[PDB]
Design a protein around this nucleic acid. Structure first.
Length: 52
DNA sequence: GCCCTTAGCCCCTTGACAGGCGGGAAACATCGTGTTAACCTTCGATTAAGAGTCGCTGAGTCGCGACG
């Protein structure tokens, strides 16, 4: 369904054991947006999972 | 019972078509060109809600020493 999503990572793709909390808003028709974090504790706008 | 004579079958010679592949000659549908010059000189999708790993790159941290 269209709307913002916050998929907290379950440890996978983490530095050691930390979570990611990828805040992604899925539009009904358009380009996806990802506001996930990293091990450096920084929010990166991974638009449509292309770049970070 | 054997030899002569004649009939039937097989074979040869000619032939009057019949039309039949096929190139030619011709009537007709293709296939690659042109050519015209009145106005816009960045078009657009598409992953991206699982998962084990190959191949490369570029930042922050240290040694060895020289010159005051």
């Amino acid at each position: 369904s269209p709307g913002v999503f916050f998929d907290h990572d379950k440890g996978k793709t983490h530095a050691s054991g930390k979570l990611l909390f990828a805040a992604r808003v899925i539009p009904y028709r358009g380009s996806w947006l990802d506001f996930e974090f990293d091990a450096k504790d920084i929010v990166y706008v991974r638009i449509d999972r292309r770049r970070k």
